[model samples]
Target chain A: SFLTEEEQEAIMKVLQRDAALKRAEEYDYLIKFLALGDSGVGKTSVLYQYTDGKFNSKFITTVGIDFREKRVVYRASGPDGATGRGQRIHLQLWDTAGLERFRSLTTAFFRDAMGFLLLFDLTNEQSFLNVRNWISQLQMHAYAENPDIVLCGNKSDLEDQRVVKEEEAIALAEKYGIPYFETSAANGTNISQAIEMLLDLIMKRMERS
Target chain B: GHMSFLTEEEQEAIMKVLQRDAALKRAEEYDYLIKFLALGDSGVGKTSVLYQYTDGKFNSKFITTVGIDFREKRVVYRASGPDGATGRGQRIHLQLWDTAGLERFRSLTTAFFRDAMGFLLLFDLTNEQSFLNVRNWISQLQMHAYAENPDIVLCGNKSDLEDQRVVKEEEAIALAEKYGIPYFETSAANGTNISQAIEMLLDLIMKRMERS
Candidate 1:
């Protein structure tokens, strides 16, 4: 479920009327994103690469939900190249369990999330196929069915092991009305762009609302 | 009931025979072994929970699990008598079967269910759809497994994310009671209730074994 109209209105009022709140050191916006996928699909690695700028090769499975946070100042451009005080967003990246035991725990975290990162391993076709489950869960639990979700195909470094075709991933993303990006958590490739794109979309939607 | 009453030593002896028989039939006989299947939808953290219990470490990387994966661990449990005097502890080897939740592997995964003494019916408290699909998975288990009323434990993993949980503890407990099963809320990352859930399943299986 997405934010209620009153909740959105309250946030809008705070943004517009609460001048003291804006001038304060607190972040202008706090965006929460949830990562979902099958076990071993690089959800954790992608988060590490994005927030920590490092890839962990020695794999240890996540027991439950783990999270990381980063602050970003984005400069929004309009059709006329207008500029203002850059938006400061505290990015909360929630790394979730991709295993069966943590389903109940992970799904519960989806309620207040503003965006989602549905991930899959390029080498594992099964993980890609199960992206639907992740998407369905996000839709059912997140604020809106068509929320700001991004499809990430991770482990692009392992080209030899790849079985999920790029075209197929794109097709699936199109079918689900979400953006798709191929990433390498090992090399920190496109990790930041994927997150930035999601935050940007959420910001645009927030602005509209 | 005598079912709940066991002399500490008697309990310890049973654990010893289970292990000894397991060793005696190392090549052929299946003894002292408790087989458990982790069943749930994809991305529900089956592999992580199994890994956390077996290795006692939380993994923070992404690695897609393929078809049926396995991990084994030996658990030492203390035997308690009516008076609460602790008796000799017994070591039981746990054979954990991690199954793929993807639909493509359904047939291949369920093939191994006949041998499972117990089932871990898992769901994500954060993801409602995964919880909704638990019944479908349970139906599949009942359709194929040898046990008409298998020993099942309902686990709501990822309890550490209390702020994000949509499924409440009462909701899960209610559903488990409706189905005549036990329920546990656990966290694989922080090692909360992971061992206890497994131990609970083992206890249920042991009780069934005694009756049979």
Candidate 2:
């Protein structure tokens, strides 16, 4: 597991065409991702799971704001269009306070985010209902008229206590033309997959821009 | 005295208008609303400290703040004269503003500082780098706040993990003294001195307001 075949090939291309890969090696691409939702929706839990692979059930309110960073090596076509290379991306994940009182303060930073994870707790119907307001705020403030966004129904492990159905979340996601993901931050289910899906969407959008 | 001569309905209407005017005046002025800001490095437990002080709980998970966050609580301050005479108690609605400590959010954070009446310069006791960053945070606060010497309190948080402490009390006290602000060692996990720090800052703001 030291290096995958694609990774090895990427390293080989870099060694063979050092001059062509100079720009790629100079600075890693930085993507700023935002986690947003109502309070007690597991936004922070999901962030911790994605960044550190740990979860704490006893987490209290996010008083103001918080952030985490992860460096990922993704294999893709080189910039020269003639070779494959490992693309280095530094993902800056921001976790914001979800209380409505902070909306004025938090929304100000929305424009700087490249993507958004609009999360909701499936166990709570109120949080699911509030997703609409969160989306509205994000749309109003984000720089992109249509920013890359993913609707995440978190806390899926507590199925017995579930109030918001998957069908309902999927319907809303479809209405907004965004992808939907059902994840459990406590059990580490689909945590990385959801992030990968979001990153993929952002990267594609970035290329188009 | 004039209202005693009026009919019941007329007196009631006049009383209503007086109540509305008083409420409007308080709402329009800065006497009732106190905005306190938290500034520190990323992992300095700024959110945890604020949460514990306001909500009386501890958050063990690590969550990265985006730009700015907010919370509020009502505090009652009992007034006292220089001669130790007891005065009336004043109620203050304290608005706590939490900001991101990341370099990218510096502009966003500083923009909110100008409106803040008080500041909490926080640093993690177990992390020396975070402690060192307090100086930079103070500088940023002084530069952006409306008042150059706004009421500031230095907080050394996470005292629950005292055995692993990298920043000593004397060092924090010295830094606080250098900046001419009160300092407190607090723990959000066990609720140690959290209220004291917040009350101290609120008290400082009240004193400043009295003088001005």
Candidate 3:
């Protein structure tokens, strides 16, 4: 499973300090996120940039699916602006290979996903157009279990040759009732905002639920 | 029962132990904490990629990933999202399996499926035959991993050697489109996106859990 760095570290610390951590409710409020898109569309790169802060110039494909974890301190409503209460969120992000061959294996990660960041490359026109299908798959396979989603158009730094423009991506996002953003993992564009935006929405839903 | 013939079993067993211990030492050096499976056909460069990405080193020994070969390398992966925080931890332990392409081994392959939270179907783009067999491997994956909603990544190996590619980018992209899966062309020899790919896949899986 996937847990954010902050969550993973803190939980690990607690386990080390208290062997009785098994009774801790397993990070009670858990959030699961997934990256969906066609293969080679930079879904993995965006994740690599956000989670590890590294960039790979050459493509190294993932075989099936891979996972990593981290922790974060999400602010809770407090009397004093910054002094109130906050909740710690542990995130498990799943980056799936956007190929049908592995679709069956992808369902588990999709089971109860809180958010899905659908991605595609800006340089590829077909990939951009294929967003509809990807989102449909997300809705079909994960919609019942996961309700939160964000549409992401990656490789925005290559805007000159961009095949998927902001306006078009935005339109699709609107149609699907989700948020959208264009980013360049290489240039450090809206990478964090995109992920955090989804997280913020999830937190709000958690409160409402 | 007095005499015995020479058997290379001693040599093979010794080599295996040495390799396993060396992998353990690497894990100690890197502080890894998770294990997963890697399944693909013969000669898709699974072992090389595993060695280079996890250990950050490259070796030309083209050997198949025998049902599994576990290795732990200390990798200081960037945490998901940009918090401007430097968290140092071992990439943790990795259980890399190299399944054979032979059909007979399919039944035996399921044994390694236990606790496998993820799956990677590796294909060699240069070889049309390997690429064509992707369907076979996918069916096997479905049988073993579909129930858990496991994360599955389809990797097209040998990106740097694209000239020899038998599968067109369009062909693969079209396949990816039809299936709705993420795709990437990479070269393990060049130390391309090997490590970053692993990190991203993990993040995607984690994010899914967060939303749910």
Candidate 4:
């Protein structure tokens, strides 16, 4: 007879690294973050700008998830603002396909990551409105009372096309005590700053944990 | 002709070579990890096909795992070109994935679709329902897999039980032709076409990889 429960339990101990994610205690390529938003919100371009240093207007829509990676040297600063040693860490940013039918599938992957990048299109009113829905999904699927999330209003360079005002977005972020940024992925504005700051918070959280 | 044809010294010499082959095969560095997923209805022989392919044994009495699991074999693949080009020893770490109950935990299994490079879509030869759901499986793969046109092999399993077989070979072949994929009627009981079917799927993936 093939007994499965105990066998799965044994593999569960070493499962995430093989099945879902690599534990932070195990590898340098452990810091995995996910970008979540409505489908056309420039999640792909934002990550492309952050990692590739430029945007692609011809970028195809991601089907499910396309993971992008880069290595950055992080200089830790504690509560006292004292600078510390810099560790070169690999950042694995997960880009998701945001079709409405894919919610249940994509939400199941939330627990695998260490952080979140919640993006919304600054030019779309509905995409901004859906931020609440995305965060609620995050609050349920992603563990912790309030997970390490960075709210991003992308396509901020679209001055005439802006639907959600800058102060309104900041006020929304203030409700959750999360940092908010208006980023321009096409011009590469605040892409690195947003991602690196998210990593810094995660690194600090790791230090305390 | 008997089991004792070889002497103890000769047996020891063969054992040393077998151990050497096992070590050398598993030691490949990179660009060789091929992950193929097993998908179909619950009662289909997905787990059995993977088990028979890997362990070379078939026990009718078994239960599939709850979540997901995988079996690995180091296969040496030789790539052939369209023209007069030949091939070489490319040791591949072939990972065949057996997933959770497709109906109950589909959302969880959806994530694994993107991780795999290829797929083995198996359906039981005697189960009409399993064959019917192949379209839904194709839809799921297109929605979640690496690409819409990922390399997949359609397998009709439990082929030895022709007395109870409900799916005909001609129908299966026509369906496979419609999808533009190869089809195989495999038997885990007597181990017919198991290795060949898997090798074909691996070849498809390797050739597709060469294109990239």
Q: Best candidate, DockQ-wise?
A: 4
lDDT of each: 0.72, 0.73, 0.63, 0.74
Q: Cα miss at B155, model 2 (Å)?
A: 32
Residue lDDT tens for model 1, A96-115: 77875445435545643688
TM-score, every prediction = 0.44, 0.46, 0.45, 0.52
Write candidate 2's Cα lDDT for B112-183 as tens digits. Answer: 554468898889999999998788777766555656566899889889897899997788889999889999
**Residue range A1-209, candidate 3, lDDT tens digits:** 22134432332332222222212333436566888888888877889888888889798765446555557666643335454466777776777767644443344345436788888888897888888877666655553434688877888888779867678878888887888888898977998889888887888776675
CA lDDT of A9 in candidate 1? 38
Interface RMSD of 3: 20.6
Residue A54 CA error for candidate 4 (Å)? 1.6
Ten residues in sequence with the least summed lDDT for candidate 2 chain B: B1-10
Instruction: List the pairs of residues colliding in candidate 4.
Output: none
Residue ranges of candidate 3 with Cα displaced over 4 Å: A1-28, A76-84, A143-146, B1-212
lDDT for each residue of candidate 4 in B1-212, tens digit (9 for 90 to 100): 11112234533443333233223333542347887888888878888888899889998886855445667887888877789576887888877777755443444455566557888888899987889888888766655564547788999999999899998778888888998888999997788888888999998988887785
Please say which candidate is ahead in lDDT: 1 or 3: 1
Per-residue lDDT of B38-132 in model 3, one digit per residue for the tens?
67777887777777777777777666443334555544554555677645543545455554444333332443454355666678889878888
lDDT of 1 at A183: 93
> Superposing all C-alpha atoms, what RMSD in Å does each candidate have to the true structure?
23.5, 20.1, 22.8, 17.3
Residue ranges of candidate 1 with Cα displaced over 4 Å: A1-26, A77-85, B1-212
Candidate 3 CA-lDDT value:
0.63
- Error (Å) of candidate 3 at residue A87 is 1.5
